[PDB]
Design a protein around this ligand. Structure first.
Ligand SMILES: O=c1ccn([C@@H]2O[C@H](COP(=O)(O)OP(=O)(O)O)[C@@H](O)[C@H]2O)c(=O)[nH]1
Lengths: 365, 364
């Protein structure tokens, strides 16, 4: 009976947008996702039969502020506004006071003065504080940065991203055949699953690969973000510099991530800036793979070092080489760790459990 | 204290003209923001009141440019003073984001007969939640705000103010102006507004027909593009009743105080309730008898028989009765008119009104 108006600024399927697919699904017969840009995320939502619409600035409030006005008027036939990004929060907060509907802010970013303008930090935080009935944080790191930026602590609740655990299971044979098709059957494959961007640190994996035995190869899965083509150029040159051209594959964007992860021997998350929540980390754990992650942000809540994956100082390529080598030398311990990771991640990040937490939290408003 | 005034209109309506008086004592530390260019902008410039037009051309900068520019500007000021409905909507948004107190100066009767229920709900909700203070230009405005669901405890009535001494005209200018208009020997009923059906000129004209031949009327004001059918209807009405030599259209005039003084009665005959009859007060300050339609703000401005006359809206025979009373009891009439000047100078002196505003702002 509760109808939700979800709002997301981006027309591109980023992590938060992908998360929103899962959040919205149980509500598809009683929800709408309003976007502020068209794009492939719109396609996806349509694929999932999640009602979706694009809200633009195209022409009393109607003329003063078209976007806000459209949101306000849509909000009238909904019971709650669920804002999924920063700009959606700003617009959602205004819409909430005008349309007289409760607001939920789902926080997916680390609200950091280094990646957000102090302008937007103050505005986002103050709007949340005064108008959000609840701020869902995707991790404790996201939670504390919100608080540190002046966010009200008592408004927050941590709810992790949820995953359909059975999608991450692949047979040994499918693994073998895919590895052959990738020509890595006799390699130690380290997989990196991220859009190519400097803060994702693919260059760190490349430097580590320089200090690894020759059987170690890398697969970079993900396409280049608009404006990062300098970075992608730096990588190719970095690689050629190091003679690694035949030991690194750029697969570009891939939708078959679980299968590709299953073909790897280790999954590496090498971000140089604190990660709010690494989806790829949890995905790798669900695939039953050893995982190594930079020791900042949400990654520290996802992995316990030595138990269900490995943590390394961000930007330190040698430390990453050492974990890679330890995985190569300590076969048994590594398999155990990887098995632990599948069990713990299934318990913690099952979409069924996450959807229950979301439902409970929403109903308690 | 620096004040950011906001007003939706580029045209100098009553609210906009009132804002000139309001802003003058603060003009070295204020800005008026308009949501459209026009003559009002020119008038502000004439008075050295800093002015600026905010538009929607280009993170809120992209999402809502107009709002974003107001917010941004508002950071430089200590208070946002919204003078109209739309300025309230925008100003409330800007008020929390920039973190500045907001005042709403309500110049309108928020009637569900002249505003859609959404604009009423939105204005009332925003004011109730974000206004530190709602200034109403009259008890009529105040009570309509509250009947729409406005928070009564937020309201204070502050009337429009006038420069008292502008409404004083010598008997020699009066005689000379009556001579030039050719009304020296007439009982002159003046009507001072633009030609519009809601302003009720046709009412005065029907009353003229129930009046002795020495009663003439002067209609002072021009016509709007939109009310051209009305103008022709007036001329036809005048010819049909045989009043063509007892009505003079003077067109638009800047010397209103002087023309009021040349009248013997000033007639306010609007057909719809108004928040605050500027013309009624001006007639009082000119020391003239004034008859007004008994609705809206008029009712607060006049005590019937004491300092002017109130007549049922739309009723020309009542109006004619008043006009004939003025002709027959000249002494009672001159006393009423003298009473009018004294009470209006007391209640609507801009010096006093400015003090009420200043006091009211300092309590925030
Ligand atoms: O080629 C790719 C690369 C990534 N992803 C997905 O994109 C999301 C990236 O999320 P993450 O939280 O790891 O990155 P962020 O968006 O925080 O930078 C994950 O679900 C990945 O499985 C994908 O579908 N195809």
């Amino acid at each position: 009976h509760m109808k939700i108006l979800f709002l997301d600024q981006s027309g591109k399927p980023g992590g938060a947008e992908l998360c929103l697919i899962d959040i919205a699904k149980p509500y598809r017969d009683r929800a709408l996702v309003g976007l502020f840009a068209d794009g492939a995320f719109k396609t996806l939502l349509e694929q999932h039969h999640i009602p979706v619409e694009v809200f633009t600035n195209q022409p009393s409030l109607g003329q003063l502020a078209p976007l806000v006005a459209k949101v306000v008027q849509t909000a009238h036939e909904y019971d709650l506004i669920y804002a999924n990004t920063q700009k959606a929060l700003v617009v959602g907060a205004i819409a909430s006071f005008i349309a007289r509907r409760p607001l939920v802010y789902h926080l997916h970013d680390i609200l950091s003065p280094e990646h957000f303008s102090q302008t937007n930090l103050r505005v986002a935080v103050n709007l949340a504080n005064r108008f959000a009935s609840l701020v869902i944080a995707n991790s404790q790191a996201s939670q504390t940065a919100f608080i540190q930026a002046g966010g009200r602590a008592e408004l927050t609740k941590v709810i992790y991203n949820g995953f359909d655990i059975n999608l991450y299971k692949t047979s040994p044979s499918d693994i073998s055949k895919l590895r052959q098709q990738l020509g890595v059957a006799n390699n130690f494959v380290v997989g990196h699953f991220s859009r190519l961007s400097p803060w994702k640190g693919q260059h760190i994996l490349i430097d580590a690969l320089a200090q690894c035995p020759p059987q170690v190869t890398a697969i970079l899965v993900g396409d280049a973000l608009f404006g990062e083509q300098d970075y992608v150029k730096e990588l190719h040159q970095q690689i050629t510099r190091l003679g690694l051209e035949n030991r690194v594959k750029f697969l570009g964007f891939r939708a078959d991530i679980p299968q590709l992860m299953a073909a790897c021997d280790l999954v590496a998350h090498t971000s140089t800036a604190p990660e709010p929540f690494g989806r790829v980390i949890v995905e790798a754990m669900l695939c039953g793979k050893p995982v190594v992650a930079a020791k900042a942000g949400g990654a520290m809540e996802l992995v316990e070092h030595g138990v269900n994956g490995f943590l390394t100082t961000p930007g330190e390529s040698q430390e990453l080489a050492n974990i890679i080598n330890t995985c190569i030398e300590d076969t048994q311990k590594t398999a155990t760790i990887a098995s632990n990771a599948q069990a713990i991640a299934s318990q913690r990040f099952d979409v069924v459990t996450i959807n229950q937490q979301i439902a409970e939290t929403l109903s308690s408003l």
